[PDB]
Amino acid sequence: AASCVLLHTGQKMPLIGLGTWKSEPGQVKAAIKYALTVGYRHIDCAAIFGNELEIGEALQETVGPGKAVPREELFVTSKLWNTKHHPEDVEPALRKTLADLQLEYLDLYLMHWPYAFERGDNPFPKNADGTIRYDATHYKDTWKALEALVAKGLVRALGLSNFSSRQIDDVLSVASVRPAVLQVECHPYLAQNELIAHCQARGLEVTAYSPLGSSDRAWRDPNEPVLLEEPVVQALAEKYNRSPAQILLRWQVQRKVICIPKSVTPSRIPQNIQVFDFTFSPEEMKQLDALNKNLRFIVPMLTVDGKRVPRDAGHPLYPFNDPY
Ligand SMILES: NC(=O)c1ccc[n+]([C@@H]2O[C@H](COP(=O)([O-])OP(=O)(O)OC[C@H]3O[C@@H](n4cnc5c(N)ncnc54)[C@H](OP(=O)(O)O)[C@@H]3O)[C@@H](O)[C@H]2O)c1
């Protein structure tokens, strides 16, 4: 039970994938192997997560010309970190990921963010005051260097992560290799309808990260409301005899949006992919659609005067200034 969408490159990309953000080492390995046993065929990774090494070890014993899962039947994604936007660094950054992942090619390689950070070995270049010392490379230059990778057959498809509609069109206006996927935060509170309509218009499929709301991200502490716990989600969870998260994921699945739910919990892993045997009626979709309130949770902290404000909102290539 795992449907998929067809990318413009002709690749079959499963609607459900295994997220690995914060899936620390000594934990993601166990998660990966079990996920594969339960049907997962789509794994979502990132160099910044600092766990691709352990992921490579899991795939080294579950995927191969002998294991239970053929390499070609797996869809592996990864992303180019912000400190590797300079054209020169792009291939070394990709290769490194392949080394850690122990693969010969990625099925999808995404630019993690449209804005760059000072190049170097420090994933988070700060200075004195502790502020992030950015870089000025434009995403279009990083993108052309990313295209050379598809040429060398190191990556089958390219995509964008955290890009705005304007930035997406900016890449499309000069692309020799067109983005196949747009990965953004997406769930009932941030439905991304406008962006989704935009991508459909540009031939890009949409991947939703933090589909459950990230439960509490790597930084958050409001007080309410909580995506899970919304009465509609609970009502549907009761009606279809499924967990609140399955309801959130099914919602995305039903509207053809790819989801890469993250989990290192044995009992949730199989549940997060088991969202293909039930369906919501049009009215229930409407009810879930009504939860939309253009609210995004995956943004910075850099607390200032007892106030939470975006840390990188100052970057000229910041993706969240425009409506979408
Ligand atoms: N491109 C980007 O910029 C970007 C950024 C961030 C993340 N991502 C990707 O998106 C993936 C998922 O996003 P996300 O991890 O932020 O959030 P998410 O998948 O919405 O939520 C993950 C949290 O939900 C819990 N959870 C998982 N399944 C559950 C279930 N069935 N019921 C209740 N709780 C459940 C997890 O706990 P346990 O693990 O303890 O089960 C974890 O604390 C990441 O792993 C990563 O691959 C991409």
Deposited resolution, Å: 2.2
The C-alpha angle with vertex 149 and arms to 148 and 155, in degrees rounded to 5, equals 145
Instruction: Determine whether the shortest distance from the Cβ of 159 to ligand 1 is under 6 A.
Output: no
Instruction: Determine whether the shortest distance from the Cβ of 19 to ligand 1 is under 6 A.
Output: yes
Which residues, other chains included, contact 121 with Cβ-Cβ below 8 Å and sequence gap of 6+?
Answer: none
Neighbours of 180 (CB within 10 A): 23
Q: How far apart are CA 141 and CA 175, in angstroms?
A: 10
Tell me the residue type at 267.
Answer: S
Are 131 and 180 within 8 A, CB to CB? Answer: no
Experimental method: X-ray
Of all atoms in ligand 1, which is nearest to the CA of residue 79? 1
**CATH number of the domain within which 246 lies:** 3.20.20.100
For helices 165-172 and 193-202, give the axis angle rounded to 10 degrees: 10
Nearest CA to ligand 1 atom 47: 19
Q: How far apart are CA 42 and CA 73, in angstroms?
A: 9
Instruction: Determine whether the shortest distance from the Cβ of 20 to ligand 1 is under 6 A.
Output: yes
Q: How far apart are CA 263 and CA 266, in angstroms?
A: 8
Q: What is the number of domains present in the chain?
A: 1
Tokens of 92: 């070394």
Instruction: Determine whether the shortest distance from the Cβ of 266 to ligand 1 is under 6 A.
Output: no
Instruction: Determine whether the shortest distance from the Cβ of 271 to ligand 1 is under 6 A.
Output: yes
Of all atoms in ligand 1, which is nearest to the CA of residue 244? 32
Distance from the first to the final alpha carbon of the chain: 33
Ligand 1 centre and the CA of 170: distance in Å?
A: 29
Domain of 289 in residue numbering reads as 1-324
Q: Which helix (H) or strand (E) holds 258?
A: strand 258-259
Q: How far apart are CA 318 and CA 324, in angstroms?
A: 12
Of all atoms in ligand 1, which is nearest to the CA of residue 272? 31
Which residues, other chains included, contact 198 with Cβ-Cβ below 8 Å and sequence gap of 6+?
Answer: 165, 168, 324
Nearest CA to ligand 1 atom 29: 268
Ligand 1 centre and the CA of 228: distance in Å?
A: 13
The gap from C-alpha 164 to its chain's centroid, in whole angstroms, comes to 15
Sign of CA dihedral 209, 214, 217, 222: positive
Tokens of 87: 């054209």
